[PDB]
Amino acid sequence: MSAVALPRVSGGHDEHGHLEEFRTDPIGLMQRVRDECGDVGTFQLAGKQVVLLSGSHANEFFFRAGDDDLDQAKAYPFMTPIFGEGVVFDASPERRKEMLHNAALRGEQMKGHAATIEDQVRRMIADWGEAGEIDLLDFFAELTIYTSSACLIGKKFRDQLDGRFAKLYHELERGTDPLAYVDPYLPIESFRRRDEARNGLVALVADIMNGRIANPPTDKSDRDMLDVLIAVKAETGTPRFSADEITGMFISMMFAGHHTSSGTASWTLIELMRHRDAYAAVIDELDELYGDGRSVSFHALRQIPQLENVLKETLRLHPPLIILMRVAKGEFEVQGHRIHEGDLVAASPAISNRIPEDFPDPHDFVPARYEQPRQEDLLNRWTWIPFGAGRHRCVGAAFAIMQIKAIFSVLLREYEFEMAQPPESYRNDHSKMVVQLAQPACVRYRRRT
Ligand code: HEM
Ligand SMILES: c1ccc(-c2cnc[nH]2)cc1
């Protein structure tokens, strides 16, 4: 005969099975898989079967699985066109990923990054005046382009960037419609805007490169990563790297941290405004903490409990990545259910972070869950997964947390924020593999004191 069918969730009778629903309501769909199927259930994503695992036992299998068992490498095909075919530092598949963020993520670099991040925020709110309104996506998306580029590539580089880079990068991120699992190069409008956006980014970098070659003045110093790549010559004296190759690398370096930090910063603010009591606790803590006269570069690397717990709760309720993917490289049994090589295996932070048994009143904002006595994040090692877990746990976790600390250490002490629309109107756009805060997301601010 053949192989036993795995539990399959209801619906999925559209052109690409469950793909359409995954686009309009991925969380509702993934939740229905768990409700109907249990810890192991499936849904059809175009021609691919997704084995969605949930619960502590199945998640453990998922996160502890080695690269040889559940391959993460080709589990996110929507990234292929974004990163590009460009090749700067040719090395192993694991090497390439390391080179992207390892250097800048060094602990010894953290202090500097916090100072850089503080500078980026003050610069971003420099023209805010006494009072006004902003849109969280516009503000945070752009801000994080500045923090990401300045920290990962260099300050000199960020100083040559402006809103254009952010607008284009945003289009890049929107070029991740689920249809990417069919083919990331399909004749889709979003995919075309993606390719065009990328081309626009390459052009912005080419302009910078040209500008630097013509006029490189300064104290003959401050030379950043772009300067080094520009100066690299091939054996004949010709520049070795094109603007595309360089841009492709820069894009790759700041991608992971951009959509995540932008959305997480937005939701942190949203949850603080939604819960004035937590907001007030954070302010008191911030004013009291910085009362020692130490800098953000000092405090952002150290304990700021109230804010951190708000952040953790914000991440539990609004995990930037609502689904994690792998490609099975063999057969494995998980609770009597068999996974076959070629199967897309997934885990969902969106779903797992709200399992009723692991997180009392999973739908409520309770930063106290992470307080010393409770520590629900640490106790549920396989289900509190905003940063994933196991072998592929987010290597940028420390940086991201420090960044949030740094950003709000400035924002919450300079301005007071209030929602300019109904608290329930703030929502995410889950139509793309890369979750983005949906607009409008209007917020009012006013100088404190
Ligand atoms: C609070 C914001 C962030 C969240 C919620 C987050 C979340 C995650 C999650 C859930 C994973 C696991 C993916 C998988 O299992 O396939 C992951 C992986 C990863 N993240 Fe993040 N991340 C954040 C920020 C960052 C930043 C800022 C960087 C770069 C400095 C980064 C770099 C990475 C890398 C390189 C991996 C792959 C690790 C590996 O496969 O070994 N992340 N992240
Ligand atoms: C595809 C897979 C993972 C990521 C990511 C990791 N950390 C933040 N985003 C972004 C795209």
UniProtKB/Swiss-Prot annotation:
Primary localisation category: cytoplasm
EC number: 1.14.15.36
Subcellular location field: Cytoplasm
GO molecular function, one term: heme binding
Keywords per UniProt: Cytoplasm, Heme, Iron, Lipid biosynthesis, Lipid metabolism, Metal-binding, Monooxygenase, Oxidoreductase, Steroid biosynthesis, Steroid metabolism, Sterol biosynthesis, Sterol metabolism
Top-level taxon in the UniProt lineage: Bacteria
Entries under InterPro entries matching the protein: CYP450_sterol_14alpha_dmase, Cyt_P450, Cyt_P450_CS, Cyt_P450_E_grp-IV, Cyt_P450_sf
Summary of activators and inhibitors of this protein: Inhibited by alpha-ethyl-N-4-pyridinyl-benzeneacetamide (EPBA) and 4,4'-dihydroxybenzophenone (DHBP).
Sequence positions that bind heme b: 72, 76, 97, 326, 392, 394
Cofactor or coenzyme needed: heme b
Reaction catalysis annotation: a 14alpha-methyl steroid + 6 reduced [2Fe-2S]-[ferredoxin] + 3 O2 + 5 H(+) = a Delta(14) steroid + formate + 6 oxidized [2Fe-2S]-[ferredoxin] + 4 H2O
GO biological process, one term: sterol biosynthetic process
Gene Ontology CC terms: cytosol
CDD domains: CYP51-like (cd11042)
UniProt-listed PROSITE patterns: CYTOCHROME_P450
Subunit structure: Homodimer.
The family this protein is said to belong to: Belongs to the cytochrome P450 family.
Function comment: Sterol 14alpha-demethylase whose physiological substrate is not known. Accepts electrons from the iron-sulfur ferredoxin Fdx encoded by an adjacent gene. In vitro, catalyzes C14-demethylation of lanosterol, 24,25-dihydrolanosterol and obtusifoliol, to produce the 8,14-dienes stereoselectively.
Stated name of the protein: Sterol 14alpha-demethylase
Organism from which the protein derives: Mycobacterium tuberculosis (strain ATCC 25618 / H37Rv)
